Structures are given as structure tokens and as C-alpha cells.
């Protein structure tokens, strides 16, 4: 539904324009129409957003591994996209947002430091 | 630091303009300055952001209570601010975003449905 689509997008920290370009391959206006509720949300886009959410879960699982190993992780929080891309040259703006989503969660809940 | 400030802000699903107006009581430019890293984040702003994160934890704890009572919660995802305000007339735009952040988490991670 429109509500599930927006929920996942925001949890993954994607701006509408970023989700539209990279996941929907549609204009931002088209993506807004999907989230507005005045349109059918196509099921394929919803499925691709759930696939991307599984990437966030994989990234969380890796941090959980460090925690089980006794480490208090120091996670890079990239305020600047360009710095993320410099350190992660095989990723893009969507990877940057997923990194923010994961680092912010672990920090805010008291489980990791940000660097 | 600027990284912690932006991380909490984004996790709570607040736009810069919303955080600036209601939490900082400053302009978006000033809030962006605090998120830039150029100087230290003010003590009172830091504390208020931590306190709002605690409100989010309290909201999660209330849902955890319902799960422990055997409910499968149907959480209302408010894509429309005014609908949230009508249902929660003592709250404002910041409370709306907190509601989105909690509903999106429990939905995307499989514990609740959205309506």
C-alpha cells in the first residue's frame, strides 16, 4: 500500500527523489503519487523496496556479530555523501542512506558510537 | 557532535525545518550549521534530542506491551500530518514524525501491520 511504501522508504532514510530515481526509475512526482494514496502502488516497486530493506538487515546482522564478539562498535556516520562515496567506491547514494539508517539506529539506542 | 545530532534527527524522521522550528527554535540555516561539524552542538539541543529519543523508546515499549498481551498490532501510519493531529490533538508535527518512526520500524521488521 502507499503507507507501507512510505514507511519503508523513510526507515531506509531515502529522500523521495533518491527512491524515485534508483528504485522506481520514475520521476519524483510519480513516486509522490504512489505515496499519496490516490493511486495504485505497483507491487513490483513494493517488492524491490522490501529487497532493499533486507540489505539493511544484513548490515545490522554484521554489527550484531561484532557486539556478540564483545566489541562496542564505532560506526561511521557520514553526514557528507561525498565522504561516504570516497570510502565506499562500489556504492552509491542509496548505499549511503542505508549506512546512515544502520549507524543512526545503533547509536541512538545506545549500542554503538559514531565516528 | 554534529553526527549524533543528525543521526537522532533522521532516525526520528524529522525534517531539518521541523527540528529547527520546534526543537532548536532557530532557523533551518542555524540547524544546518549545528549539523555541519564547524562547532559544537549546544548542550540544551543535545539533551532535548536525547529526550525525544526516549519518547520513541517509550512508544516502542507500549507496543511491546501489546505484543506481550497477544495482540498483532495494526498501527496507523499517518502519511497525512493533519490526520495524526486530529487523532492526537495535544501533539504537534514532532510527535507525528515519532509516530511514523515507530510504525515504520515495527512494520518493516515484521511485528506489526500498517493501516
Q: Where are the domains of chain B?
A: 2-114
Q: Is B114 helix (H, G, I), strand (E, B) or coil?
A: strand
Q: Which of residues 40-69 of B touch A (CB under 8 A)?
A: 53, 57
> Which residues of B define the annotated binding site?
33, 91
| Nearest-neighbour CA in chain A from B72: distance (Å) | 16
Cell of B110: 515484521
A77 to chain B, any CB pair closer than 8 A? The answer is: yes
User: Could you tell me the CA-to-CA distances from A36 to A3, A14, A20, A29, B78 in Å, in that order?
Assistant: 9, 17, 14, 10, 11
DSSP B5: H
Cell of A47: 517488492
CB count within 10 Å of CB A48 equals 16
A108 to chain B, any CB pair closer than 8 A? The answer is: yes
Q: For residue B39, what are the contacts with CB-CB under 8 A and spacing of at least 6?
A: B33
Q: State the Cα torsion B8-A109-B72-B79 to the nearest 10°.
A: 0
CB contact under 8 A, A13 and B10: yes
- CATH number for region A2-114: 1.10.3100.10
How far is it, in rounded angstroms, from Cα A113 to Cα A74? 5
- Give me the count of residues in chain B: 115
Strand partners, B113: B74
Q: Answer whether A45's CB lies under 8 Å from A8's CB.
A: no
Cell of B14: 524529522
How far is it, in rounded angstroms, from Cα A102 to Cα A104? 6
* Resolution expressed in Å: 1.3
| Nearest-neighbour CA in chain A from B37: distance (Å) | 9
The secondary structure element, H or E, covering residue B84 is helix B81-87
CB contact under 8 A, A4 and B107: yes
How far is it, in rounded angstroms, from Cα A72 to Cα A94? 26
Q: Answer whether B77's CB lies under 8 Å from B104's CB.
A: yes
User: Could you tell me the CA-to-CA distances from A40 to A8, B93, B97 in Å, in that order?
Assistant: 17, 27, 24
Query: How are the residues of chain A apportioned to helix, strand and coil, as percentages rounded to the nearest 5?
Result: 65, 5, 30
Nearest residue to B96 via CA among B105, B88, B104: B88
CB contact under 8 A, B4 and A105: no
Q: For residue B66, what are the contacts with CB-CB under 8 A and spacing of at least 6?
A: B73
- Helices and strands of chain A, counted as H and E runs: 6, 2
User: Could you tell me the CA-to-CA distances from A86 to A21, A22, A80, A89, B49 in Å, in that order?
Assistant: 21, 20, 10, 6, 30
Structure solved via: X-ray
Amino acid at each position: 500500500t502507499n503507507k507501507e511504501l512510505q514507511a519503508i522508504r523513510k526507515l531506509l532514510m531515502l529522500d523521495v527523489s533518491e527512491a524515485a530515481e534508483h528504485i522506481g526509475r520514475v520521476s519524483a512526482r510519480s513516486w509522490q503519487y504512489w505515496e499519496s494514496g490516490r493511486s495504485a502502488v505497483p507491487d513490483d516497486v513494493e517488492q524491490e523496496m522490501l529487497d532493499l530493506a533486507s540489505v539493511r538487515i544484513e548490515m545490522m546482522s554484521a554489527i550484531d556479530k561484532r557486539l556478540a564478539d564483545g566489541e562496542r562498535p564505532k560506526l561511521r556516520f557520514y553526514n557528507k555523501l561525498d565522504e561516504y562515496l570516497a570510502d565506499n567506491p562500489d556504492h552509491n547514494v542509496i548505499g549511503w542512506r542505508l549506512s546512515q539508517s544502520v549507524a543512526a539506529l545503533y547509536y541512538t539506542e545506545g549500542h554503538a558510537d559514531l565516528i
